[PDB]
Curated annotation (Swiss-Prot):
PTM remark: May be sumoylated. Ubiquitinated. Polyubiquitination involves WWP1 and leads to proteasomal degradation of this protein.
Subunit structure and binding partners: Binds DNA as a homotetramer. Isoform composition of the tetramer may determine transactivation activity. Interacts with HIPK2. Interacts with SSRP1, leading to stimulate coactivator activity. Interacts with PDS5A. Interacts (via activation domain) with NOC2L. Interacts with WWP1.
SAM domain boundaries: 6-68
Subcellular location: Nucleus
Name of this chain's protein: Tumor protein 63
Length: 70
């Protein structure tokens, strides 16, 4: 049986936030990870063909999470 965790990627993070199509794109590209977005600043995301309309939101959500928690 699992032990709390089972799969840890941006998929679960998008599910909570309400992000739908953006999660699809991420899992389809095969580059969805939590610890990576925590190091991949706004520039890498822009170079990943991610538009500002969503890019700054993804980054803001995770940076806000790690900022509000420990």
């Amino acid at each position: 049986g699992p032990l709390g965790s089972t799969d840890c990627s941006i998929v679960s993070f998008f599910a909570r936030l309400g992000c739908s199509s953006c999660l699809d794109y991420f899992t389809t590209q095969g580059l969805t990870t939590i610890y990576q977005i925590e190091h991949y600043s706004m520039d890498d995301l822009a170079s990943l063909k991610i538009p500002e309309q969503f890019r700054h939101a993804i980054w803001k959500g995770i940076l806000d999470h790690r900022q509000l928690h420990d």
